[PDB]
């Protein structure tokens, strides 16, 4: 009863499971249209792709986050009741809080400690048969995140810590044991920082102003209370983690730069204005985060589709990413791309669209960027290695995906 | 004033521990009363056994089960706050789901399930030097249960899955560590369950319409909300557990077997008849579920004895199965005493009395027929079998029971 | 308001707390010339005191209330949530005549008694094993008396793993990191422990005796006449059963006593119970074991030039108080017979509390701990003859609980 | 006959000893109680040194080799691996009192 096109299959979020990144983009190639209606996730939803649609989705006076996406992903990914699921000026306030810790002085000092300690690792790399990138990315990005936020980290729970970071992050599009795994993780690293949370309001640990810990321990919400214990240690979580989650992407940029060759020796004639552009292109080309989920909070008309209030919505990240309409051969990787491109909110949304401000987007962008640039410039400048035989496959289907090989590096010597 | 038998011990509780099945008949029996006043389980109660008792036990206006048992039966056996405690309206709604998966349909084809599966162990069986029946019996069951009810299983959990559901049996009537095994076990089973509740409301697990994963995980209440899918756990698990504790049922009817051998050659001329009759003695003989607890929901008068509002009443179950008043020779196993018996719906009570759509009474009485007719069939028929020394003494102080050896068999050979 | 009270400014007091540990406040009230100082200290603005004159402050209740005056940590550690250290009013006496009920002299007696004959029982092994750690024997002990006091079962295969949850909760309320961490995982252990026993015994599944601290921490009713919860009763009853365990701290000070002060070892041996509870009391009083106390000000009032507001935090020192010149000659000097002929004061000699138990806070067990601290005692001059060998006997002011870092282990033991 | 002697004492000192733990007990298994006893004065009155963290195991492997002497399968095996830790365990201490290391 609508000419908005309707899948009608039951089994849709098993699909869900089987098709992955390409499961909105299947279905708007199909029907074609930038919109359609689908059972999903236990929710009669519309999934929609494209900058028009981004637009749309970002209104916060059309849609809401609360209710949004299954428990599933709060305990697994997010945390229970954070700021992902937030509206209003109540998350507007707190969003301020991640945004002062994300500024370019402090992206410039997590940069920074990133390349002294690639540089550091090059003489156990060379002294290593094998080397993963993925894990020494994971465990090189614990030890930064935590040490940049004052969080206490002994060297004898580094992989423990950094192994339950990356659980959390690889479950949120998962069934199964990888999903049990990030719902067993979660509790444990919650109750790890709510004790620093809990001995930093008793003075009992040393904080510094300026820090995660400390602004997490002390922030005050709008009416001048602090975050109850475990939310301060939820919402510092959701700073320590996504920071060794860019291990993704420091391995795909590794993949880039193996698969693209040509762009290895470009890197080196050029500067920070050519890894700028290798690192947006590797952030638009491969897959991290499938889709956005929100709720309609007003009844609405768009596209010719009658937006009802509660109804689920889907943005298409990965599909706007790769659209025809807005990029000029969408699969394929070329950095050039980004020479002289005007900046644009909807169009590259592969940490979220619109502004961060005023909205639910990563504030921990120029973040992954720098620290992405950082590490380019290591593989490119520092070291010389071999990619022997593996899988550097990756599967669109899996969620979040991730080469299986994991990048594996031998015979690495210093340059 | 009642000058009714009054039990004026203040240790009634642990005397109830080293009867068992026998506590309240041995005082009935004292005290030339069907019923007698007692302190047991923290409760000023009134035991009460035979034919006449069950029939008022079961007056849904005199009695409620609501607040009727300790919460240590709750948090091992039944779950806190399932279909054991639940009174009115509001429970027959409840126990209408139960029943649409027992009807004889699924009688049928858990039984079915259970002849396939024990004619496949045969050549698993003659290669072994000694079978433990009960480890046989409800490691089969367990995957005959999770099979028939959609639930996932895989091979490398099926004996921890079974374990899990045999120690909340095994604990229902027991102290110390045997009790706290079965409150171990509830909260593994659990969250076990509850995954694939919150995985199938969220259509990320498979399920299919009729079968009891799914009408657990969809079923709506009176006001037409689901339950929460801690509750459709745990009713979920009030299926799956009671199957696997037929094992106990099958380890007395094969015991029962070896102990009479004459009716083995007399099941074997005959056929279905005298596989139920078999069947239904071996329920009535042995023990399994000793009483039932309930409370007086108003004043009322019976037996000459004044039942005052609160109070605790225990139903003898393995008394009533033992009346010589309803039973000739009641300490006999007997199967004879069945052929062509009409229904009576509180002389034969081992899995509670009344009927089941207006009360308590237990839904799977006709799975546990079949299931128990399909594997008796299969020791008469399929093998022979040596029954080497062993204790197949059972205690009737221990609640639930069981011969110690668990009936192992030896020299097993097809026929 | 206060500007004439001595103010410590630094933001890190707290910090500086767990450096100093038993000597924070003593090194401020000297440092200032004042038996009052200023500070923030675990998250609150706070008014440290010392003196057996602020104590008598301390445990007027009109002034002072216990109830969220310590942070929640030593509730997940120690004390319990909720439990009878947060209590003021009615109800907070009616459970103290609980714990008083089960700590009268002849619980005293029994107790001791019980210790004696497992004392004289540990000699047949002792004498067959190269060293013994006397932390570690007592301890075992304790919990095995405890329990059997008590009428807890305790199982043989059990008793280290309970015994040392009891010491990690204990040895974890002044500490951060993994020694508090310790209490933090121990006290759910204990507790689902002890409340099964609570609720078996409210079925009638487990046997109870009237008069012991199961059977009335279990039956217990409140003012209103209802039971406490059952996770509640259980919290009460570790609230008697550990802190008994915890008297292996003084038995450890005790050996270490006679060690370090040899000519007091034929001073006992040549005297009776009497020269027994003067050593005991002077090892209560010259070692540290309870550090401050905290309370929060229950309603304004005024006391030595300062202005005490309500809900200000208040911390009482308890080892400065003890080793006070203006109370002890020589204080800083083991002397037991100090304690010949000494007025009974319920001030100026608080290392379990101050005041009245059935009135105030005052630690109930104090006649249990100086009884069985006595039997022990005994055990350790008449019973056997040991060496004891080269190890660190040193114990650190700072570290809270505090211990001789060795246990006095010890060797060489054989019967008298 | 003085050997004799010297073990039933010792023996008599560790059964009046036990009493106060056995009456703290609900159960108490006489075999398990006997050979933790044995084995410690066993030891102590031979000049073979054991700590007490070590009773159990070391008299769980006495009498692991006993109760396989008749026995196939894993009773038999029992003492099959019971024999080789307690071969060791003793060997280094004719090893140490050999070389003045071990007091004898
Ligand atoms: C590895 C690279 C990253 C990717 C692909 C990524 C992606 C995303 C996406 C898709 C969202 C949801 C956006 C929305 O709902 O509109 C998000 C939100 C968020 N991200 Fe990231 N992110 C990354 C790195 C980081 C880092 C390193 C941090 C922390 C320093 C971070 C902090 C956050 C926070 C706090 C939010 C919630 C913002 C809010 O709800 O207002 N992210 N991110
Ligand atoms: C092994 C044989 C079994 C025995 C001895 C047994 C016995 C009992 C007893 C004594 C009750 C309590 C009756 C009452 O309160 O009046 C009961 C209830 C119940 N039984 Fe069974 N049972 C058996 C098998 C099963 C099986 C195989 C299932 C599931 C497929 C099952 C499902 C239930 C349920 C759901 C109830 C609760 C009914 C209600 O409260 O309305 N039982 N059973
Ligand atoms: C025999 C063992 C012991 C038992 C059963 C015991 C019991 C208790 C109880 C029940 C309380 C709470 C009283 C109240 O809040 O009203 C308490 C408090 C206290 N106990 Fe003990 N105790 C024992 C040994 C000790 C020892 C050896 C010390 C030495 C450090 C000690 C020091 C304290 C302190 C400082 C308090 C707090 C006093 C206050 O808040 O005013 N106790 N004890
Ligand atoms: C099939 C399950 C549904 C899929 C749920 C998708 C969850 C949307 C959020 C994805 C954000 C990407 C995560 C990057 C790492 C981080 O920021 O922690
Ligand atoms: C300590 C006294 C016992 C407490 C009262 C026991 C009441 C429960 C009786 C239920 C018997 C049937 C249990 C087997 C089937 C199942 O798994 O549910
Ligand atoms: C940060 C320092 C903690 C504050 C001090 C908390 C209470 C100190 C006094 C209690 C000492 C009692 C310890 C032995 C008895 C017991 O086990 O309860």
């Given at each position: 009863?609508?000419?908005?096109?309707?899948?009608?299959?039951?089994?849709?979020?098993?699909?869900?499971?089987?098709?992955?990144?390409?499961?909105?983009?299947?279905?708007?190639?199909?029907?074609?249209?930038?919109?359609?209606?689908?059972?999903?996730?236990?929710?009669?939803?519309?999934?929609?792709?494209?900058?028009?649609?981004?637009?749309?989705?970002?209104?916060?006076?059309?849609?809401?986050?609360?209710?949004?996406?299954?428990?599933?992903?709060?305990?697994?990914?997010?945390?229970?009741?954070?700021?992902?699921?937030?509206?209003?000026?109540?998350?507007?306030?707190?969003?301020?809080?991640?945004?002062?810790?994300?500024?370019?002085?402090?992206?410039?000092?997590?940069?920074?400690?990133?390349?002294?300690?690639?540089?550091?690792?090059?003489?156990?790399?060379?002294?290593?048969?094998?080397?993963?990138?993925?894990?020494?990315?994971?465990?090189?990005?614990?030890?930064?995140?935590?040490?940049?936020?004052?969080?206490?980290?002994?060297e004898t729970e580094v992989?423990?810590?950094?192994?339950?970071?990356?659980?959390?992050?690889?479950?949120?599009?998962?069934?199964?044991?990888?999903?049990?795994?990030?719902?067993?993780?979660?509790?444990?690293?919650?109750?790890?920082?709510?004790?620093?949370?809990?001995?930093?309001?008793?003075?009992?640990?040393?904080?510094?102003?300026?820090?995660?810990?400390?602004?997490?321990?002390?922030?005050?919400?709008?009416?001048?209370?602090?975050?109850?214990?475990?939310?301060?240690?939820?919402?510092?979580?959701?700073?320590?983690?996504?920071?060794?989650?860019?291990?993704?992407?420091?391995?795909?940029?590794?993949?880039?730069?193996?698969?693209?060759?040509?762009?290895?020796?470009?890197?080196?004639?050029?500067?920070?204005?050519?890894?700028?552009?290798?690192?947006?292109?590797?952030?638009?080309?491969?897959?991290?985060?499938?889709?956005?989920?929100?709720?309609?909070?007003?009844?609405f008309v768009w596209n010719?589709?009658?937006?009802?209030?509660?109804?689920?919505?889907?943005?298409?990240?990965?599909?706007?990413?790769?659209?025809?309409?807005?990029?000029?051969?969408?699969?394929?990787?070329?950095?050039?791309?980004?020479?002289?491109?005007?900046?644009?909110?909807?169009?590259?949304?592969?940490?979220?669209?619109?502004?961060?401000?005023?909205?639910?987007?990563?504030?921990?962008?120029?973040?992954?960027?720098?620290?992405?640039?950082?590490?380019?410039?290591?593989?490119?400048?520092?070291?010389?290695?071999?990619?022997?035989?593996?899988?550097?496959?990756?599967?669109?289907?899996?969620?979040?995906?991730?080469?299986?090989?994991?990048?594996?590096?031998?015979?690495?010597?210093?340059?």
């Amino acid at each position: 009863n609508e000419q908005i096109p309707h899948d009608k299959s039951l089994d849709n979020s098993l699909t869900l499971l089987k098709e992955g990144y390409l499961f909105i983009k299947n279905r708007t190639e199909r029907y074609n249209s930038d919109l359609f209606q689908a059972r999903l996730l236990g929710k009669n939803a519309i999934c929609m792709t494209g900058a028009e649609a981004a637009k749309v989705f970002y209104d916060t006076d059309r849609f809401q986050r609360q209710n949004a996406l299954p428990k599933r992903v709060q305990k697994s990914l997010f945390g229970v009741n954070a700021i992902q699921g937030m509206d209003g000026s109540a998350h507007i306030h707190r969003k301020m809080l991640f945004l002062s810790l994300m500024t370019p002085p402090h992206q410039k000092r997590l940069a920074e400690l990133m390349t002294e300690e690639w540089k550091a690792a090059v003489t156990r790399w060379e002294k290593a048969d094998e080397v993963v990138l993925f894990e020494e990315a994971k465990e090189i990005l614990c030890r930064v995140a935590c040490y940049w936020a004052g969080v206490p980290l002994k060297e004898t729970e580094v992989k423990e810590r950094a192994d339950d970071f990356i659980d959390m992050v690889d479950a949120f599009g998962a069934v199964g044991p990888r999903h049990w795994k990030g719902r067993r993780a979660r509790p444990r690293a919650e109750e790890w920082i709510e004790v620093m949370i809990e001995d930093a309001r008793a003075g009992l640990l040393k904080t510094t102003s300026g820090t995660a810990l400390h602004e997490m321990a002390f922030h005050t919400q709008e009416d001048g209370s602090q975050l109850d214990s475990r939310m301060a240690a939820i919402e510092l979580i959701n700073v320590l983690r996504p920071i060794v989650a860019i291990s993704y992407f420091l391995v795909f940029s590794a993949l880039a730069l193996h698969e693209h060759p040509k762009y290895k020796e470009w890197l080196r004639s050029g500067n920070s204005r050519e890894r700028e552009m290798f690192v947006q292109e590797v952030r638009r080309y491969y897959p991290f985060g499938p889709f956005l989920g929100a709720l309609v909070k007003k009844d609405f008309v768009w596209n010719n589709c009658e937006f009802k209030k509660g109804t689920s919505v889907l943005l298409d990240l990965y599909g706007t990413n790769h659209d025809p309409r807005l990029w000029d051969h969408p699969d394929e990787f070329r950095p050039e791309r980004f020479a002289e491109r005007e900046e644009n909110l909807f169009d590259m949304i592969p940490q979220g669209g619109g502004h961060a401000e005023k909205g639910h987007r990563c504030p921990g962008e120029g973040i992954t960027i720098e620290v992405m640039k950082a590490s380019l410039d290591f593989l490119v400048h520092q070291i010389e290695y071999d990619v022997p035989e593996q899988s550097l496959h990756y599967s669109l289907a899996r969620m979040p995906s991730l080469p299986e090989s994991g990048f594996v590096m031998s015979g690495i010597r210093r340059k």
